[PDB]
């Protein structure tokens, strides 16, 4: 039974690899997963945002059925403890199970007292050891959670949290802008800590701050220890990088050295963090048999609340590599993201793969994998996918659904998206670069003729349309 | 049979690896390699310039048996093409082979005419195909050698090579400063070609003159088509770079992204172009019954002949990692290079290595993995290293010659370098950044005790002295 481990990047698009497109600046470590294994062309993540594509991922349901949605960093736990879990199912094969990286998911039952044991939290859902950012890089608090407790905390001087109103003594962005590396959208312009504002306030803490420049070496290193300690038993571990998402203040190791500024530094720092981790694999002779799959939470993003030169030091590059959308998308770039696999006991046919295949299909895949026998209420909405992650010839899926502040499915080369009729959130004004693809008008393309969706052939094909809403339809029915 | 790939740097010191110890540069592609294979920490080359640890890899034999050494851009084939070498005897088993890079071994049996078929060549060393920089980057002609014929040449336009006097109309270095990228010393501003002063002058041959910034892609595509055209045969790939050889003219792709200049830009530029055809073999399916082998021709140099920032943006970096000496040096660095040997298929165990080893014991190894029997007097001075080779729990050698100016002799932990009462070259004096070893007294160190060789103890041991000198005297004296 193989060792997993699941390289986990945030926001990181289509075209954002090397081995993807990417001229401007190269990612070796990923790119020679993707010589050595499978390079998928089709593959999905769950969801356009972090929150509702991590619940998929771990769960095996779509995200829509407990209306998961990005969380802020007091949020209760979304995921129910009491259920099977993707690491749960492990655990059952006899697996060890750990987490390092970025969390949002939820940590305990309704009010997070940070300063006492926070449960339930990963380990309840089936991580024998966790090491966390509990939201994402831009929200508070502003710490590290590990396993039950968060690390260096003091006592006399302790941690609380608010999304409400500013608490504490830490200046604030809006405030203090000679305090800033960089600039903050009002939404970012909060609490300061390590000269870079976030979105919320947090109070006491000291001693349990994070400096971000320090995160490459602060992650690989638990990953490796937890690699050691577990290397003679069978181990998964998920590795949720905070890269690429802002704010990107990449290591001095990395700063500047993409010439696409921080976004591109932060895209280096991401395969470096890799490397570290695969090479120890190889090192340690557990690489071969060893299943990774390295893959995306969501689509790209330029600017997404500092002032971090994305769009100014962009210049030719593409980080969807031609698909329309991007992050918080309905369209293509939305979910559409790097997915490789390396396996080298078990991958019958490196090369290219375009299965069509979801984030949602890891859980019963990996099931098969690990020999465990799913209840028919365990990963509904999953489906095995296995040959397809190890044959470059397989092919995989024959619908999918992707999700977004809308629905959208895809059947073969026919890309539907549902007319949108609700309100989004006030942030995502600040997000028009991309195209989020809501509209109260159905739309349907044909990839095939039409991989970019400029070409909206509803009003063609009225025929189909009412067939793939009725299956979204039909999908938000399923009892 | 495995094929066989030799990856041979320039000028590549023992601590210009991230794998070895340098921080302020990253190298994973060659470092990847280091993590599954097995890394070596005493592998030499036999000397410590050019052409002489070019020489004793292909025959076999130790360089001083021939009066190899730096040779000019217009030197007949100093190898003789009536005897065997490593590529003939790879021939006899079968192997279809090949070299990409520079030669540096001489062409021609007297005068070469560029504007005609030059041979002999690599061609009739036992090379099915050749694409050959003819000396060294800072040498003239500044042209492709294609097999036996220059690359892109005009016979209306035709090419001559002096060493001795200026011909031709090109400007040189000494009367147009303004059209230099980096200044020269005096050896180096002869003939300009592309923005850069060479050694020697050259005439004619406006269509075939290279471009010092194409280099990688010019030499990954000649080699991966090597590949692509021979993938279904067994096959040997000699890869000798440019890099990290002076001039420095990093393609725009590493160009500022070291920090180190120029120098530690060639050493990103040698790592791209490794896991180029590193992805090749991944990718076609060969990487797992082929062997790599990674080293470099001697050791490094910081200023080489050109003001391109080697020294002032070095920082805290060591390219001899503690080692005494360098390029030309008899002191351990001058041999003392990184090796890395990689082949999934055959390696026993991996990790890191201490067996004693050098370049000149490439030739029985490979011979005994291609299961050919060599003649009484075939590669006389190589050895069978393959246990070593393939199992980083395996030794080497008793003893082990280096070559310089002088001549030295590895014994185990004892390091002896023979007096030297002779003359050098007054361009060495351009290079005294360096210790060379060169001394009247003869020296002795325990690099067991003293790695530097700081503290020499050959007046604490004139007996070892004199049985070590005895062997060096043996060794120049077998017939
Ligand atoms: O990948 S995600 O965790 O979904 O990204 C979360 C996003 O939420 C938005 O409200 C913020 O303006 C973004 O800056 C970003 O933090
Ligand atoms: O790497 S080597 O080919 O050994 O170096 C040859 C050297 O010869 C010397 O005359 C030059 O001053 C150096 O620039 C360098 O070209
Ligand atoms: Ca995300
Ligand atoms: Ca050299």
Same mark, same amino acid.
């Given at each position: ?63 829509? *059925? ?181 704010? *990107? ?77 991007? +992050? ?120 095939? +003729? ?27 029915? *399923?009892?």
């Amino acid at each position: 039974k193989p060792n997993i481990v699941i390289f986990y990047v945030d926001d990181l698009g289509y075209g954002d690899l090397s081995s993807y497109g990417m001229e401007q600046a190269q990612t070796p470590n990923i790119d020679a997963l993707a010589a050595e294994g499978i390079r998928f062309t089709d593959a999905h993540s769950s969801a356009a945002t972090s929150t509702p594509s991590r619940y998929s991922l771990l769960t095996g349901q779509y995200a829509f *059925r407990n209306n998961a949605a990005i969380l802020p960093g007091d949020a209760p736990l979304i995921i129910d403890h009491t259920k099977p879990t993707l690491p749960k199912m492990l655990q059952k094969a006899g697996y060890k199970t750990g987490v390092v990286g970025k969390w949002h998911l939820g940590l305990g039952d309704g009010f997070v007292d940070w300063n006492k044991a926070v449960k339930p939290g990963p380990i309840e859902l089936g991580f024998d050891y966790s090491f966390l950012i509990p939201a994402t890089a831009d929200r508070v608090p502003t710490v590290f959670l590990e396993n039950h407790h968060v690390v260096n905390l003091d006592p006399n001087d302790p941690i609380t949290v608010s999304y409400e109103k500013r608490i504490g003594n830490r200046p604030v962005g809006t405030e203090h802008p000679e305090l800033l590396k960089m600039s903050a959208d009002l939404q970012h312009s909060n609490t300061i800590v390590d000269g870079v504002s976030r979105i919320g306030w947090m109070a006491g803490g000291k001693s349990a701050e994070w400096k971000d420049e320090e995160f490459p070496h602060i992650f690989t290193k638990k990953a490796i220890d937890f690699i050691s300690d577990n290397k003679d038993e069978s181990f998964m571990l998920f590795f949720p990088f905070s890269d690429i998402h802002v704010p *990107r203040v990449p290591n001095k190791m990395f700063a500047g050295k993409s010439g696409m500024g921080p976004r591109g530094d932060a895209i280096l720092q991401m395969d470096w963090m890799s490397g570290q981790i695969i090479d120890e694999l190889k090192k340690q002779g557990l690489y071969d048999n060893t299943l990774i799959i390295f893959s995306s939470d969501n689509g790209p993003v330029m600017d997404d609340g500092y002032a971090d030169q994305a769009e100014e030091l962009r210049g030719d590059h593409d980080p969807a590599a031609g698909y329309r959308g991007g +992050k918080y998308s309905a369209y293509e770039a939305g979910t559409r993201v790097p997915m490789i696999i390396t396996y080298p006991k078990g991958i019958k046919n490196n090369g290219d793969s375009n299965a069509l295949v979801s984030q949602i299909d890891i859980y019963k895949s990996l099931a098969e994998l690990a020999g465990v026998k799913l209840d028919n209420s365990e990963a509904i909405d999953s489906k095995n996918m296995l040959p397809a992650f190890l044959d470059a010839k397989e092919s995989g899926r024959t619908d999918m659904l992707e999700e977004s502040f809308t629905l959208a499915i895809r059947s073969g080369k026919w890309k539907y998206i549902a007319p949108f009729n609700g309100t989004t959130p006030d942030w995502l004004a600040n997000k028009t670069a991309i195209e989020n693809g809501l509209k109260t008008e159905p739309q349907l393309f044909d990839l095939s +003729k039409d991989r970019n969706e400029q070409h909206n052939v509803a009003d063609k094909y009225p025929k189909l349309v009412f067939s793939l809403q009725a299956k979204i339809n039909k999908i938000k029915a *399923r009892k």
